DNA sequence: GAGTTATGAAAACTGCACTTTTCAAACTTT
DNA sequence: AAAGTTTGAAAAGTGCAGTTTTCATAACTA
DNA sequence: GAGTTATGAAAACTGCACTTTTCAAACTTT
DNA sequence: AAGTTTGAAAAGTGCAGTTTTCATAACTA
């Protein structure tokens, strides 16, 4: 059903009401692929509708995110920040929901996104655009008439070079690891280095995703739409580690043919993987702007284009939906325009 | 017979009433071709003629499926999940409780899907959607009051959201070797080897091999012609060179005499009845692991893909693929007509 | 937006009301790509926006079809014939629209489709299914309740073989033609034989659809989705005829680079093309079950699979969306299953 | 600002009022990069407010398009057609659906499309749909009563290989035909130079027509040509001098007698820039003469030819993007695309 | 020990609604 | 005719709203 | 003359709903 | 060891529905 824009006497509570409706809608529309507990999500939907305060909305959205509904985090906090800005006590422009305009929103962004990055500022703006677009489509009185806001509010990533990649690979075997985790951790990080696959892609690998032929592994990676993409790496890079780890793995209560697992048998967390990557980066003395697994992913793509000069190959290997993403790992010398002008006089 | 939409005071109980009617209709409309015990299905239909609880509906449909009515599994579980959802959600979705079946709309169904399909495959989501669409399409067509007028749901759910796994010629050779090389007990070795080999060479489906009968085997010009029963009184044929199974077939038929099988069924369990896909899969996967060919799919159907692929690589005849596999549509046969190594070598000089 | 099932006291008149609504909807949903006069369509929709008699519905739907809205012809006549059936049976024995069921519809099909082909019978049934499906979706009373019908009502085509094709080609040049039409007609029919393109495809060909390279023409054929498919043809088959006709073509007031045209300068009709093809068929002594341009299309597809045994090749050349369509030009020998069993060796 | 949905007695004239409001907004939001004489546009923005007839609105939209505001053409004509539909349908049929703006819905719009897009291409139909959706989305966001409440249409409408080019051998024949075909002494040097520059660099029609001599820089036998883009941004292409050396010097001498405006390299007899229409005619004329007539016979087809050849020669997708000036690599990817003889030989 | 849970912040993607452009017949001028 | 321009028509091209994931640290358990 | 207009009939396609099956972990029996 | 039950994940297809052409009559030029 639809609701009138203003149902309550208190404008701040009415704003909170629309924010709750919006965040609840997003919980039902955003991806649920990583939801671990279906029952917690169901509870969240009801608890969002029963919420009467900002702190309550915050708690339930956190509950939703921690249950596997990751996408909600981008929308929740920014809108709760705006509610705080709107509800702030003042003396002597905030007595109605219809007073909210682009002037007010611009002021809010300026105050609340001061020491935040440009990317974070973008997220805040997107969240605002989503909320008021929702309100415009869902508010309505008995005359089937509505109030309309119409709010619009109108290069190489950090990486390791070839030589630094060599040192990093050496450091994986040179750094100290306990006997319980050394085989597993070295295998996990090296696969990421040699394939450039994402963090969650590596942590969710299965044994049956692996096939060996002519001294080279083909690894299938499950993606969106349940579509698989393939990556290849030479067997000798991980043959010794894989043989060693599979033996140790037999002592674990591992579930669903999962390759990497903790002692309990479940998949490792991003937090654990990051710290294992970062401490090796430190040991190698290679600390920079970014120091995690995705930084290694940027490194593989950069090296791939440097070695092969094939943009399509980068797209297919990295799993980019568009070549415009693959472009980020390239730089064009303007003098090379001469190569295009020379096609008429040489093959 | 048509019924009024709401005959009870409890909407949750009224929902159960329509679900039971729908599931009984599907049992009579969906294929009963694979049903062995007809009496069991009749008993199921008898129970579904009365009002049943959720627990009772679950038990009945399971009994029907295990009897041979396979199609019911696609509709049964998702709708029982929705009843479970509706019984608790109708009270706490909003401040005011949903006290009527008319409160069920497209938004509610969308929310049910998002919650109950979290973490499941895209294919599973589609099955749930199809199940929900079928139920309320049925209600729209079978409900009416005294004046022959009906309530219409009109649920639409407009939101809807390479080469298959196989073994190449070299891998197929290694698999055939492993069939004879792997350890099997004397009681099942002859039967299982013959069963799996026929699948590999002909590419017939699992149930087709499990339902093979002795009278459908003919030998001429050093080649077998195997007839496979299809829809109704239809039969499709496959051919297989004699020397591939002639030794095994003779050996198995001898040992088959010790089994208490009541008919001319070729393959049978220790009790005499037909083997299941579950046992066939386990034996196939076991040989695959032994050969080190473990991958995305490790069943008999993967061997079926391997046959279709190899057939197209050797003859390049799409019509031949259709006739050999028994495809009704050439859009299926077309599938078997479908530079990462360069990226993997960058680490070397 | 929606109307009660029964608004009038007379059931027969109320039936015409729903038929008129359905036919108006189809004039809005069916393809208008072939419409030549937009003003005629404008007049048709205006007339269909009110209550019409049976004769009026027939006249208006005919006007729409003749204006280029071809699809409407499949729905109009069968439904108007049902109204005639309903009116007669009501007076002889039907008190309400609710009385219409599958038993009644089955009897109608038995009486009115007698002597007609199975394909024609199928068209009648499809029209009935469309009407009552529409009514089920559009009827509603003041209480938001509706009546539901739920009506369900539950080998190689004629061609010329290789030898007959050769005789037909010779007959095109051998038969007598007027000097004013000979060059154009010979080229038009030969292109159909050599490419197997549809009738309307040949009639709407443009000069710039032709490109010549290394003694071979590539003809681009515009089809569904406004997408083009390519067919190739050896130059020596039509190059002389093409050069001759283009010269003669300069005498015509033809526009938009249209290849074939009448003396007025516009595209030729299907009626003229059929009669030209048919008289050559009769002259060659090749008359059979089908004698038009589409029979030549079936002949091309049959020959293509015969000489190449490539089903994909047939699909792409003929412009089939699915391979199941191309299948009808194939004949599988059941003994060839041994060829599939010998792949292991 | 915002206005009440219904201010006029005649809903037909009220419809035109909203259409005029919408088109004026598009004139101020769509690109004004190709706009020379900005005062002519400010003139149009005023005449858009004053337009109270279909003829007045049609005239100013054409005036705006001529001024360089090209994007308006996609929206103006389809909405002028709908106004024509609404107007005559109301006066003739007198159906209740035309007695108020509120009675316009998806059904009415569907009937309009079936009538006014009959015999038209699918691409054109998509343009008509976009224009209709844009109009009523604008009205939903700009209408208000005294109590700041709005009527909402929420209109939704049901949805509806290598590009044509010359290969390397065909490009050779085309280049020869440029010099072989007959041209008058007045235009031969100008036309040959203009077309050859397009062939060798693959730049767009408008880019070539707006070239200026000051943006040319010769160094060691190779030209660097700057091409003006959006804002203050320029892109560059390179061109070997021997391709155009003779033609360039010859044309510049003839150019001395022209009353050239804005320091343009190419111009008409009056001194102003040549149009795409004239450029197309000259290219098509050579194409026909060379016996290369195909599905597309303009300068953009020559552009497709350059990109296709460039990728076949070097297999460098980034090089293609930079040389052609593609903003998106999805466009550059098209030139990586691509057994019909096997079916044509069945008659032998 | 060998890892997890929680979290504000900062990206890392994805695709289509919409913008921007030329095609090419009809028309006008010198 | 040569030398152009106007115009309906038909695309050709892409910026940015919107979705999904990781960064990188604190607080746990011992 | 060389074609068009009109028409009931007879196809010639096109595409996606939804029916039917196996996968494969968990569970049971001889 | 030798099986079956079961939630889950596909594998596969018949038919509603759309868009032509067939083939003849009746014309005029
Ligand atoms: Cl590249």
Author numbering:
A (entry chain A): 1 to 92, 97 to 158, 170 to 362
B (entry chain D): 1 to 161, 170 to 346, 351 to 361
C (entry chain B): 1 to 93, 98 to 158, 170 to 360
D (entry chain C): 1 to 160, 170 to 347, 351 to 360
What does the original paper state about this entry?
In bacteria and archaea, chromosome dimers are monomerized by members of a large family of tyrosine recombinases, the Xer recombinases. Many other organisms (including Lactococcus, Helicobacter, Campylobacter spp. and archaea) employ a single Xer recombinase system, with a prime example, XerH/difH, found in Helicobacter pylori, a gastric pathogen implicated in peptic ulcer disease and gastric cancer. Xer recombinases are members of the tyrosine site-specific recombinase superfamily, a large group of enzymes that catalyze DNA breakage and rejoining using a conserved tyrosine nucleophile. Here, we present two crystal structures of the H. pylori XerH recombinase in complex with its recombination site difH.
We then co-crystallized full-length wild-type XerH with a 30 bp difH DNA duplex. The resulting 2.1 Å resolution structure shows a synaptic complex with two difH molecules and four XerH subunits. Each difH site interacts with two XerH molecules, one molecule (molecule A) binding to the left arm and one (molecule B) to the right arm. The two domains of each subunit form a tight, C-shaped clamp around one arm of the difH site. Perhaps the most unexpected feature of the XerH-difH synaptic complex structure is the DNA conformation, which is nearly straight. Both DNA molecules in the synapse resemble B-form DNA, with a wide angle (165°) between the two difH arms. Instead, the main difference in the recognition of the two arms involves a conserved thymine base (T4/T5') in the outer parts of the arms: In the left arm, T4 forms hydrophobic contacts with XerH αK and makes a specific hydrogen bond with lysine K290 (red insert), whereas in the right arm T5' is closer to the center of difH and cannot make these interactions. While the αN-αO segment of molecule A is fully ordered, the linker and αO are partially disordered in molecule B. Also, helices αO point in different directions (~100° rotation). The catalytic tyrosine Y344 is far away (5.2–5.8 Å) from the scissile phosphate in all subunits, so the structure represents a catalytically inactive synaptic complex, implying a conformational change is required prior to catalysis. The pre-cleavage synaptic complex crystal structure contains nearly straight difH DNA, and XerH is in a catalytically inactive conformation.
